[PDB]
Amino acid sequence: KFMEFPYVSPTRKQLMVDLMSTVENRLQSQLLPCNLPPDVRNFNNPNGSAEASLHIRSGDKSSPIDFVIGSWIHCKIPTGVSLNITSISGFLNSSTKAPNFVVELIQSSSLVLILDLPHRKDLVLNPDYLKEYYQDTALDSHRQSLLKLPEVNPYVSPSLFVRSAFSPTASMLKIDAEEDKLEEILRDHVSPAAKEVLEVWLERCVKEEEEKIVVGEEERMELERRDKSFRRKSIEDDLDLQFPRMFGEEVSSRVVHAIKEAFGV
Amino acid sequence: RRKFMEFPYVSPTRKQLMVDLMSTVENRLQSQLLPCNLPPDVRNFNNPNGSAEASLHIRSGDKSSPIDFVIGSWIHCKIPTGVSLNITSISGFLNSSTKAPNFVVELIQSSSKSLVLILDLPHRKDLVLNPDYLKEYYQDTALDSHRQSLLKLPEVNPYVSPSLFVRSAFSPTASMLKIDAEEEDKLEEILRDHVSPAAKEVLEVWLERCVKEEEEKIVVGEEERMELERRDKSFRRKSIEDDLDLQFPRMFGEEVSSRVVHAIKEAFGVL
Ligand SMILES: C=CC1=C(C)/C(=C/C2=NC(=C3\c4[nH]c(Cc5[nH]c(C=O)c(C)c5CC)c(C)c4C(=O)[C@@H]3C(=O)OC)/[C@@H](CCC(=O)O)[C@@H]2C)NC1=O
Ligand SMILES: C=CC1=C(C)/C(=C/C2=NC(=C3\c4[nH]c(Cc5[nH]c(C=O)c(C)c5CC)c(C)c4C(=O)[C@@H]3C(=O)OC)/[C@@H](CCC(=O)O)[C@@H]2C)NC1=O
Ligand code: NA
Ligand code: NA
């Protein structure tokens, strides 16, 4: 269990737990046991400059879920600075068309937040999917709400892919600053927002009893290609050239092997 | 009784940018632009009461040309609020004989508070599915530089549209900007010193890297061709039934709208 969240702050560490828990609970009926070798559920750099923990529960069949993943990456920058990442991502299989789920707190020095329900179909070709999963809900409210905060501004990634892989309502934020209020921000706004978002994913994207015969060979293969494309790109950009570094060639390869396998790539 | 290239109600700087822009297009694509065949009724029109006045300019592309058609326009309208709305724009649309990006530049001044600028090379293929399309037309270029460059200016800020559709229909490098204040004096400087160069450079990459002659002998495969067709349909469809279908009957009265919306839907090839 990576539920320890060692290096993070209590407030941050607390959000990750509530979030992860809700996930595993509201979904027990459809999630399988974590079947990762202890060698992957927890790993670090030989020299001890970086430690991490992974948690991956795959979905049962008949279930709309492909798999879920939680993790925290703690590293020590040779510049004396410490990088700490904590995330939770939900991936759906092609038996469903509904958006995925992702929340991430990223802090190298301020703090970067990523909260969103990643669309799984082209929104320009499918104007109805846009209406169904984003207009109707209130995903945009959470983004705008967080914006009002003075020490909170829009975060635009250096990667164009990242920018396009996220939905129009996705919350990509850079919260500048000074513990004190930061933790207040997390507990009073971020968490409420993050939990609300996850809420919509569960009750409207995962839970369901409508999809008879729907999603035919073509539309379905469409999804598997797009999901595959996305999953591969993101692993080649975040792992392939960032892991051999943080934990040495020995580790990465085996951890990235597991992941690429978990991701079907 | 104003012509398209007259741009009556806006300012000199804005008016000049729109003229330079449309002319560069017309001059640089002489070889493949067909002349405007819009009836007088559609080139220029207004609401019988005098509240709204508009001018349209559409040049369809010849066959063998990668161009669907280019359209230029300006809408002047006086809101029951006592305030006036002015929109000027130029869009370039490519047909299925190519996969290359489209082109758009729009200036929108609803209130006397802010001028909204929309400058982008709208993508025509899904970027997550086609990462190479993303690398070819966006990374490789310097399109994002225009966006962050213009953003440094204190008076300039991000403009996030009420419409989720609009938010997705644009490329990640698009410049969706909200330019501050009515400090006429400084506004005119920005458009003159920054927006103009930015737009002409953007239009420049469209002309020489999306449209550009060279070996245009590249045939869009059978299935890629159909996707483009479908996605272009969807986009145009949405775009018109959102901007025109809900706003025109209001601005110029049912009589004119149906006439101009009909001409537009025809040039966009929709049903
Ligand atoms: C839907 C799921 C996901 C999305 C959308 C996602 C997005 C982003 N991750 C970044 C980063 C990142 N991620 C990880 C972990 C990780 N990545 C994957 C990918 O498949 C997996 C499975 C895992 C778990 C093992 C590390 C170690 C790490 C960085 O060092 C990097 C970062 O913070 O640098 C400052 C950001 C790129 C930077 C940018 O904005 O230009 C970008 C925001 N990461 C997702 O997991
Ligand atoms: C590739 C081409 C185009 C793109 C991509 C495009 C995008 C946008 N137009 C908006 C608007 C808009 N457009 C027009 C004219 C017009 N629309 C079409 C559509 O097919 C045609 C053919 C024409 C005739 C030339 C009017 C009158 C009008 C508004 O009142 C509205 C606006 O700004 O209100 C403040 C924005 C809505 C969301 C927002 O507020 O951010 C959004 C940014 N408009 C294009 O023309
Ligand atoms: Na703010
Ligand atoms: Na600025």
From Swiss-Prot, chain B:
Tissue specificity is:
Expressed in all tissues tested, including roots.
Domain of life of the organism in this record? Eukaryota
**UniProt keyword Membrane, yes or no:** yes
One annotated GO biological process = defense response to other organism
Which chain positions carry the site (Important for stereospecificity of the product)? F170
Identify the enzyme class.
oxidoreductase
**Keyword Mitochondrion recorded:** no
Q: Which GO terms describe its cellular component?
A: chloroplast; chloroplast envelope; chloroplast stroma; chloroplast thylakoid membrane; cytoplasm; cytosol; mitochondrion; plasma membrane
What pathway is this protein said to act in by its record? Porphyrin-containing compound metabolism; chlorophyll degradation
Q: Which residues form a coiled coil?
A: 207-238
Reaction it catalyzes = primary fluorescent chlorophyll catabolite + 2 oxidized [2Fe-2S]-[ferredoxin] = red chlorophyll catabolite + 2 reduced [2Fe-2S]-[ferredoxin] + 3 H(+)
The entry marks the following residues as binding red chlorophyll catabolite, namely E106, Y159, V160, S161, D243
Which molecular-function annotation in GO is an example for this chain? red chlorophyll catabolite reductase activity
Protein's cellular compartments: Plastid, Chloroplast stroma; Plastid, Chloroplast thylakoid membrane
Q: Any further remarks?
A: The absence of light completely suppresses cell death in acd2 mutants.
According to its UniProt entry, what is the function of this protein? Catalyzes the key reaction of chlorophyll catabolism, porphyrin macrocycle cleavage of pheophorbide a (pheide a) to a primary fluorescent catabolite (pFCC). Works in a two-step reaction with pheophorbide a oxygenase (PaO) by reducing the C20/C1 double bond of the intermediate, RCC. Belongs to the chlorophyll catabolic enzymes (CCEs).
Subunit notes for this chain?
Homodimer. Interacts with HCAR. Interacts with SGR1, NYC1, NOL, PPH, PAO and the LHCII complex. Part of a SGR1-CCE-LHCII complex, which acts in chlorophyll breakdown.
What is the protein's name according to its record?
Red chlorophyll catabolite reductase, chloroplastic
Q: Which residues of the full protein are shown?
A: 49 to 319 of 319
